Amino acid sequence: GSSRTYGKEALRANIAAVKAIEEALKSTYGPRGMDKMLVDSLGDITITNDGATILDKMDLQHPTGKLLVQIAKGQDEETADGTKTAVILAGELAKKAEDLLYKEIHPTIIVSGYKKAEEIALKTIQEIAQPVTINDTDVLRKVALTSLGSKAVAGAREYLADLVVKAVAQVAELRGDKWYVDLDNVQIVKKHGGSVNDTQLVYGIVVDKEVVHPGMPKRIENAKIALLDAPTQMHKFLEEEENILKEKVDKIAATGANVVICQKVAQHYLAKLAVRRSDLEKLARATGGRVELDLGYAALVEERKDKMVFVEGAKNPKSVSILIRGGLERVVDETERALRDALGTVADVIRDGRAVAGGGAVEIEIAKRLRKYAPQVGGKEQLAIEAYANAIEGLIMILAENAGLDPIDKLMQLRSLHENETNKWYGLNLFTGNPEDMWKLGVIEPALVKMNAVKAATEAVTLVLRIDDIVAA
Amino acid sequence: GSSRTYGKEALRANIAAVKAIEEALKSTYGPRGMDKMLVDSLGDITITNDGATILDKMDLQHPTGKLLVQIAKGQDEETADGTKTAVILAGELAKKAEDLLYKEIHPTIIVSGYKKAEEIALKTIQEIAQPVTINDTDVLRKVALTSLGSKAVAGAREYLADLVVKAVAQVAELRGDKWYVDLDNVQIVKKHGGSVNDTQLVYGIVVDKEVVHPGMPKRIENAKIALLDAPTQMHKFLEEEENILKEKVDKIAATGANVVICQKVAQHYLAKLAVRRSDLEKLARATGGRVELDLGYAALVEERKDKMVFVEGAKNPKSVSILIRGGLERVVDETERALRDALGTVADVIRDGRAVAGGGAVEIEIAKRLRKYAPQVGGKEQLAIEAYANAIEGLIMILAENAGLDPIDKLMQLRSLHENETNKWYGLNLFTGNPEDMWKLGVIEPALVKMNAVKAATEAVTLVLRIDDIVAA
Ligand SMILES: Nc1ncnc2c1ncn2[C@@H]1O[C@H](COP(=O)(O)OP(=O)(O)OP(=O)(O)O)[C@@H](O)[C@H]1O
Ligand SMILES: Nc1ncnc2c1ncn2[C@@H]1O[C@H](COP(=O)(O)OP(=O)(O)OP(=O)(O)O)[C@@H](O)[C@H]1O
Numbered sequence: 001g002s003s004r005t006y007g008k009e010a011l012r013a014n015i016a017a018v019k020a021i022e023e024a025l026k027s028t029y030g031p032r033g034m035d036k037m038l039v040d041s042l043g044d045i046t047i048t049n050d051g052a053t054i055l056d057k058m059d060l061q062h063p064t065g066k067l068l069v070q071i072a073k074g075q076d077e078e079t080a081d082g083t084k085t086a087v088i089l090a091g092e093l094a095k096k097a098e099d100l101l102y103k104e105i106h107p108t109i110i111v112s113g114y115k116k117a118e119e120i121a122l123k124t125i126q127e128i129a130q131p132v133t134i135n136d137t138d139v140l141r142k143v144a145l146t147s148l149g150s151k152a153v154a155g156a157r158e159y160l161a162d163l164v165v166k167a168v169a170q171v172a173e174l175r176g177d178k179w180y181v182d183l184d185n186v187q188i189v190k191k192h193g194g195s196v197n198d199t200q201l202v203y204g205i206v207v208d209k210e211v212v213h214p215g216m217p218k219r220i221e222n223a224k225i226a227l228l229d230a231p232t233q234m235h236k237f238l239e240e241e242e243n244i245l246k247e248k249v250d251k252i253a254a255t256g257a258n259v260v261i262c263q264k265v266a267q268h269y270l271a272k273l274a275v276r277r278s279d280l281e282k283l284a285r286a287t288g289g290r291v292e293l294d295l296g297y298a299a300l301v302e303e304r305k306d307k308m309v310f311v312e313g314a315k316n317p318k319s320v321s322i323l324i325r326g327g328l329e330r331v332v333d334e335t336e337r338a339l340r341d342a343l344g345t346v347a348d349v350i351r352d353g354r355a356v357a358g359g360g361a362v363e364i365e366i367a368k369r370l371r372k373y374a375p376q377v378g379g380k381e382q383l384a385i386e387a388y389a390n391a392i393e394g395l396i397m398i399l400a401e402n403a404g405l406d407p408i409d410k411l412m413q414l415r416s417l418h419e420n421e422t423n424k425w426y427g428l429n430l431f432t433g434n435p436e437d438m439w440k441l442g443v444i445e446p447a448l449v450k451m452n453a454v455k456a457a458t459e460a461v462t463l464v465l466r467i468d469d470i471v472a473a
Numbered sequence: 474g475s476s477r478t479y480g481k482e483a484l485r486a487n488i489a490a491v492k493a494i495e496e497a498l499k500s501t502y503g504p505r506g507m508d509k510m511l512v513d514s515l516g517d518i519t520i521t522n523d524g525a526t527i528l529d530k531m532d533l534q535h536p537t538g539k540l541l542v543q544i545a546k547g548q549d550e551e552t553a554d555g556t557k558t559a560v561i562l563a564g565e566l567a568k569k570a571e572d573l574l575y576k577e578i579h580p581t582i583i584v585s586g587y588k589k590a591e592e593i594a595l596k597t598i599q600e601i602a603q604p605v606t607i608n609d610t611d612v613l614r615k616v617a618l619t620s621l622g623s624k625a626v627a628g629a630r631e632y633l634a635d636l637v638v639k640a641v642a643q644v645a646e647l648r649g650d651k652w653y654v655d656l657d658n659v660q661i662v663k664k665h666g667g668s669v670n671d672t673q674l675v676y677g678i679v680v681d682k683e684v685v686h687p688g689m690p691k692r693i694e695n696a697k698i699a700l701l702d703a704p705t706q707m708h709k710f711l712e713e714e715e716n717i718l719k720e721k722v723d724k725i726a727a728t729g730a731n732v733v734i735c736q737k738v739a740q741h742y743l744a745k746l747a748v749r750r751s752d753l754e755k756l757a758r759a760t761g762g763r764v765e766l767d768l769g770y771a772a773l774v775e776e777r778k779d780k781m782v783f784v785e786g787a788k789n790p791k792s793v794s795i796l797i798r799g800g801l802e803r804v805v806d807e808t809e810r811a812l813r814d815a816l817g818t819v820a821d822v823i824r825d826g827r828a829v830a831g832g833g834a835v836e837i838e839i840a841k842r843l844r845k846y847a848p849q850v851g852g853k854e855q856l857a858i859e860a861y862a863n864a865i866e867g868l869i870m871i872l873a874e875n876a877g878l879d880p881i882d883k884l885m886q887l888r889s890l891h892e893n894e895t896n897k898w899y900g901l902n903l904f905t906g907n908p909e910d911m912w913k914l915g916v917i918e919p920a921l922v923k924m925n926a927v928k929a930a931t932e933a934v935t936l937v938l939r940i941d942d943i944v945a946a
């Protein structure tokens with residue numbers, strides 16, 4: 001025994017799976033949006049509004065949904081943002097395809113329409129965007145703040161916004177006639193007992209070591225660094241192992257190193273600087289050293305009051321550390337998850353120097369270009385392009401409907417404001433119900449994240465259409 | 474206990490099996506055609522439109538269908554194309570035989586009709602086709618492109634089309650007063666990190682070796698090649714095994730070889746070229762060597778920046794390698810499955826120098842010859858030949874019906890266009906709904922694949938008729 005299902009009934013059964021997976025996410029479309037409660041088989045309780053999190057702990061019985069979710073998860077590791085937008089948009093394009101199938105259009109006309117709209121949308125995003133550079137640091141601060149905000153740690157402590165902006169403004173490499181960065185170049189340190197304004201940047205590389213040995217010179221300058229993975233006969237062996245302590249000095253003097261860090265007593269003779277205990281790799285990347293004596297170099301090393309050790313002016317100038325100290329664990333452990341995602345959004349601007357307004361300002365310029373382009377295509381395909389435009393505007397209703405407003409009128413006001421000339425940045429504010437200019441409010445996101453949202457939605461829906469039949473064996 | 478079933482009811486039960494197996498395939502008749510989803514017993518999901526793939530993972534309860542599928546699978550290994558056409562045509566000839574049995578004609582009249590139509594069809598294909606040669610490289614490019622297209626790798630990167638055309642235009646042997654080729658003569662290499670336009674031909678034989686030993690002369694010219702499957706007493710054995718390293722030099726000097734490849738250190742003394750590690754068979758076929766020292770010969774050997782090793786101008790000039798490097802695995806692994814099937818279609822033209830238009834242009838010349846021939850046969854057999862012609866035209870409805878068009882009118886327009894003189898290449902375009910000239914659009918397939926489609930369909934249906942009774946024990 002096995003089941004075969006084919007034709008319109010298999011296509012309806014696939015669309016009813018996509019409109020279920022989108023229904024699970026619709027309400028959490030941020031900001032100012034609801035959370036979901038997830039309970040596991042053990043009885044743990046979790047509260048979340050992070051879509052990449054929900055899609056790993058919800059569980060899905062239907063195989064076509066299992067393909068849609070896999071595309072939306074694959075979407076999160078390539079770019080890091082737009083996990084929910086690429087599911088909502090893929091929900092709307094299917095819901096509006098259902099209106100075209102009742103007019104008896106064949107699916108290969110619809111799919112040819114969508115893949116003919118997406119290529120004029122991606123051109124329009126590159127046309128309406130505006131360029132930005134590292135020197136435009138106000139715009140970098142506005143992007144950081146927008147990605148950072150809506151948690152307890154926020155731009156009420158705007159020191160966090162300058163902290164991240166300065167930290168990646170330091171690490172700028174130049175490649176492809178453009179700037180380049182990666183998160184491997186900038187490191188955190190996390191500890192408890194502190195304050196969120198006590199967190200600081202350094203322009204140096206730092207470890208929260210509570211001890212280094214007391215006789216040693218706690219300031220070292222214009223210096224060389226080494227990073228290391230390095231009865232009667234019983235008394236002779238015991239001495240031979242105590243002489244192996246002096247063999248550390250013997251081989252440091254063989255190379256002239258000043259501070260010497262080893263993975264895992266005779267420290268009075270060394271004092272006549274040792275660090276007791278993947279971080280040696282970070283020190284090597286800062287110092288230019290290597291983990292037989294190969295040395296690295298730095299302008300200053302210090303230990304200072306909890307208690308800490310600092311390296312400053314290491315040979316590679318494009319490396320930075322930041323330290324978070326907070327009074328409770330719950331603050332620190334989510335502040336990392338906010339702060340490095342903010343920095344990893346600034347990096348999505350800096351890797352490609354365009355920026356576009358949030359708030360639904362992009363969708364309504366796209367929904368104008370399509371409705372001016374559709375009369376040129378003329379055939380049955382014209383109904384598929386106009387059915388695409390109605391599905392992109394249908395996104396910002398899910399943004400207005402979510403902040404308590406009346407959705408239809410607060411769509412019509414925006415569309416009428418865009419029929420006037422210029423005005424291209426008007427969109428929804430969400431902390432007051434009226435439309436406002438999104439650039440002067442400073443609400444911005446990088447173009448690469450919108451392009452990935454549009455492309456992963458069209459790729460996901462044109463794989464749910466264009467399945468005729470289901471066989472199992 | 475056992476079952477016996479005989480007469481009209483056994484014949485109806487066989488035809489209802491053939492019209493089920495054809496019903497599973499009808500919609501995927503390409504291009505621009507739907508896919509099917511196949512789920513296995515483990516829970517893996519697969520999406521496909523390749524008929525030779527569907528028929529191995531669908532599973533079939535009925536024994537007559539199990540014979541039809543076995544003929545259609547056997548069809549794919551002899552010629553490589555026409556797995557679906559030979560099932561659809563075998564579906565139509567049975568569906569139209571059912572209309573003749575209700576007029577009470579006996580089955581041995583029908584089968585005598587079909588086997589009397591197929592012999593005038595095979596003559597007509599040899600009459601209406603047009604010849605082609607290697608020098609007609611535009612037609613080779615058009616055939617390559619038609620077989621290559623409708624994937625992400627396509628003639629948007631037309632470098633792939635010239636890549637394959639040049640690659641088999643080099644390997645041409647002459648036999649039977651005709652050209653001859655096989656796929657054993659041309660080899661690929663596949664690696665990750667690349668681009669689809671970074672893929673290149675060579676007119677040489679190549680391995681993506683990331684290393685060869687650093688002292689050795691990395692350029693060798695007008696050269697000879699060897700291809701090889703080749704306490705106190707403990708110190709004497711250890712030395713005897715180290716002298717066996719120098720015995721490689723000792724036996725290379727005994728034959729004067731310049732580069733020496735062995736299946737599975739003293740390389741400084743060899744340097745005073747060694748390759749560290751079925752490919753020795755390919756090198757032997759290029760070099761004219763053999764895997765006791767038999768040597769092969771080549772004009773140049775080089776190692777160059779990833780990193781690679783090249784052999785150029787080997788003794789046999791009718792051997793070629795191509796290299797695919799792509800930025801992701803998913804691209805490379807299906808690009809092989811497209812690119813070698815494109816090349817293995819050019820080989821189906823070159824092995825037999827006729828070509829015929831696609832798009833349903835052949836079917837409507839055959840459906841004219843039959844309806845002019847049928848009045849000569851005169852008896853009850855006349856109804857079986859005209860019932861054959863209606864079943865070949867009934868194929869291009871499944872091509873028009875599939876691209877969203879209205880099927881009947883877009884048949885009648887083609888038939889009326891063929892009642893005019895010449896025009897013999899008019900057929901369906903599928904990227905716009907009107908008929909167009911298929912030769913100027915460049916849509917071509919080799920005659921040997923159509924002949925195998927006609928012959929394997931008539932052979933499959935005349936075995937489903939002409940079964941009277943089913944016995945089991
Ligand atoms: N201050 C704001 N005012 C208006 N719209 C905003 C504001 N901040 C963000 N948005 C909009 O919120 C949407 C993104 O919603 P949300 O942040 O919940 O999902 P996401 O970040 O894409 O998801 P994920 O982080 O899981 O990938 C975009 O349309 C964006 O422009
Ligand atoms: N560009 C085209 N326009 C019109 N018809 C085309 C075009 N390309 C191919 N065809 C037609 O498509 C049919 C073959 O369909 P399809 O390629 O799906 O099956 P197949 O190649 O025979 O199957 P398989 O590859 O599994 O053996 C032939 O009638 C051919 O002439």
Ligand SMILES: [Mg+2]
Binds near residue numbers: 081082
């Ligand atoms: Mg976001």
Ligand SMILES: [Mg+2]
Binds near residue numbers: 554555
């Ligand atoms: Mg084919």
